[PDB]
Structure formats: C-alpha cells, structure tokens
From a paper:
Tyrosinases, bifunctional metalloenzymes, catalyze the oxidation of monophenols and o-diphenols to o-quinones, the precursor compounds of the brown-coloured pigment melanin. Eukaryotic tyrosinases are expressed as inactive zymogens (∼50–80 kDa; latent L-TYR) before being proteolytically activated by the removal of a C-terminal active-site-shielding domain (∼20 kDa). Evidently, the function of the C-terminal domain is not restricted to a shutter function but it may also act as molecular machinery to incorporate copper ions into the active site. Isoform abPPO4 was isolated and extensively purified from the natural source (Agaricus bisporus), which contains a total of six polyphenol oxidases (PPOs).
Here, not only the first crystal structure of the mushroom tyrosinase abPPO4 is presented in its active form (Ser2–Ser383) and in its 21 kDa heavier latent form (Ser2–Thr545), but furthermore the simultaneous presence of both forms within one single-crystal structure is shown. The protein crystallized in space group C2 as a crystallo­graphic heterodimer composed of one polypeptide chain of L-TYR (Ser2–Thr556) and one chain of A-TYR (Ser2–Ser383) as well as two half POM discs ([TeW6O24]6−). The polyoxoanion [TeW6O24]6− with the Anderson–Evans-type structure was deliberately used as a cocrystallization agent to obtain single crystals suitable for X-ray diffraction. The crystal structure of mushroom tyrosinase abPPO4 was solved by combining molecular replacement (MR) and single-wavelength anomalous dispersion (SAD), benefiting from the anomalous scattering signal of the tungsten provided by the cocrystallized POM. The crystal structure of abPPO4 described here with a crystallographic heterodimeric constitution allows a direct comparison between the two active sites of a latent (zymogen) tyrosinase (L-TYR) and its proteolytically activated form (A-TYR). Hence, the CuA site seems to be fixed irrespective of whether or not the C-terminal domain is present. Thus, a coordination of the CuB ion that includes this seventh His282 may be assumed to be an alternative conformation with a minor probability (CuB2; occupancy 0.09). This would result in a somewhat flexible CuB site. The residue Phe454 acts as the substrate placeholder, pointing directly towards CuB at a distance of 4.3 Å (C∊2–CuB). Therefore, an active-site blocking function of the C-terminal domain in a comparable manner can be supported by the data presented here. Thus, each polyoxoanion is bound by a total of eight amino acids from two equivalent monomers (A-TYR abPPO4 or L-TYR abPPO4).
Author numbering: 2 to 383
The structure:
Amino acid sequence: SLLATVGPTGGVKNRLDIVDFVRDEKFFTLYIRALQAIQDKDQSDYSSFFQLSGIHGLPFTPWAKPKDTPTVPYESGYCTHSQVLFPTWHRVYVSIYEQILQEAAKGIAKKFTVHKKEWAQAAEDLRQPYWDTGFALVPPDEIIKLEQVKITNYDGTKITVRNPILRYSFHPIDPSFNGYPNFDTWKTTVRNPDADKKENIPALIGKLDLEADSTREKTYNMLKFNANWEAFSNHGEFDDTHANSLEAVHDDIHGFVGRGAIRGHMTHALFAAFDPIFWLHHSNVDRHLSLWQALYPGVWVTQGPEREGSMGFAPGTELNKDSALEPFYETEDKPWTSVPLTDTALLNYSYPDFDKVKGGTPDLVRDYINDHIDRRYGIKKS
Ligand SMILES: [Cu+]
Ligand SMILES: [Cu+]
Ligand code: NA
C-alpha cells in the first residue's frame, strides 16, 4: 500500500454520538473544516473524499496501490456485502476515513490564531461520530436540514459556513458514472429524490419519523439474538435466516435516505459512499459490532464464499478470518485481517457505551452492556 490504514492518532478516544458531537464547538468546527477540506481536494488525490468514498463502489479502480501490483481479481467495488467479511471490512473502512479525516483536521487546527494547543488537542481527540439510528432515527438539523452551520472561526469569532455534511459536490462527475442514467447528470449527491430528480428533505424527515419505532425493534433483535456469525455477518441472499443480521438491519438505513420516488445515492452500493452521511451510518454500524461483541465474546469471523463479488474477492472465492481486507493495510507490506480487528483499540478508537466499565471483566461488561441495550432499544418511543 501507498497509504496504510493505521487509524487516527492521540491514543484511544471515543466516537461521540452525533447528537452530542454537534454540541461540541471544537469537534464540530474541526469536522466541518476538515470535511470541506477533503471534499475540495483533487479527486485523483488518494487522501481525498472522492477516492476514500470511491473505495466502496465506483469507480472500479485500485486504491493506494503500488506501481507494479498484480491486477485485481475482479473489477468492481471494494466493499464486502452478503458475505462473512461485511462487519470487519467496514470496520477498517471507517478507520482509513477517520484517519485521513483527522489528518486534515490537524492542518486545520494550525490555522487557528488563538488556543492553538486546544485546537491541536481537539484534532488529536477527533473521531468519527456515529448516528444512533436505533434510538434516534431522525438526526440533528446540522446533519439533515441546515444549509448553513455555526462554527468557530480561526480568530475565535463565531461564523456560519455552508454545510459539507448534507452533500458532496463532484468535481468533476467521474467518467465511470456515464452508463448510469440518473447519477451521470447529478452534480451533487442527493437524498430521497423525487420524480423530477429534485431532493426532498421534508419528505425524508417524515419517512424517518414513521420508520423510527420499527427501526429500534429491528436493532434490538439484531444485537441481542445472534449466536452464530453467519446469521449475524451478512444478509445474503436476503433470505429469512439472515434477516436479523448486522447487514440486514444496516440496509434499511440506506433505503430510507437514498430511496425516494427514484433511487438516490444512499440506496445504491456504487454511489452510497459518496454521501457524507454514509460515514455517520457505518460508524454506528461499527458501534453495533462493538456492542454485540460485549454480548457474544469469543464469536468472530467464520468461513464463507464470496457470492456478490468485490475487487478483493471474485465470486466463489472462499473467505475466512485470515482473508486479506483490501485495500486496507496494517503496514506497507501487511494487509489487514479479521482476526486482530476484534480490538478497536488497535485503531485508537472506542465508544462511550463502555466508559463506566473500562478494564472490567468480560462477565461484568456483558451484563452492563446487556442492560444498556435493553434499556435503550427495548423500550417505547423516545
Ligand atoms: Cu459497504
Ligand atoms: Cu452501507
Ligand atoms: Na472503487
């Protein structure tokens, strides 16, 4: 790899709930600045928003690969779907994003004229916030509605700049979008589009509000009831025995956001990553994995075939815990694997759900987290 996925820096910090995250002046300002920074980078820059999101689906090109690397076994996206590697591949996927996103936030923290240390420390603690869809499906206005958002300027004064969280603006629309009727002319990413291809946020807020109750119940059953890895990892082939998987419950959020009258970006695996809200989603999807690990310790990746097909594995290939997770590398010559990814500390992150039980026995944690899930996703509306 040209850019190994080593994760963020500054020790093990928590990925905050977006509801709390937006209330944090330093974190929110750094996120809005850094996110705009990587969105404005050249799309041929590997550490740019485009190439980072491009890893998931289109374009079908290698990411941060050496000059004389062997041809990829399959021309398609990188993301692993309908297979046993879904949870682990996406865990390290958010890691490279969070890593690159912090790196931009460091340069941002140097532009501040006052409190240079505190801005430097905030960047060090900066992590990808998660969207708790199971407890609060309707996100904050900063994420879904506010065209302009309040941040702190480099002099300390409060200003309002355009919100980079709502949508990404292609520059240009990559030549690999040509064949697809609606996404080739769409200048920016779109959520819940109408028949006239116009974005419809109001209808989206309405959709989420109604799907809220069912989403909490789906999330509850997913977290608590999954002994074997096969039924928990993937959904394929959208059957009943996988309906309670981490991915199946994960699919509903892509549909809610992307699927309107016509299909938007979030409801298409080849374009879903380009929507900025994609990362808040899969940060929470990763939190589910962390919570599930607390309930089902010892259970991890089991063997399974590549059914859909990705640029890492051709259809029919056998996959296990020792399978390489392209294009994510521990070092220059060592690809990531599922085995070590049980410990998020290796990527310098964690979730606030575990704060009151740090350094506790697996038994105490399993009881604390279980009560946590029951109390949060096992009760009535919020
Ligand atoms: Cu994916
Ligand atoms: Cu997804
Ligand atoms: Na790609």
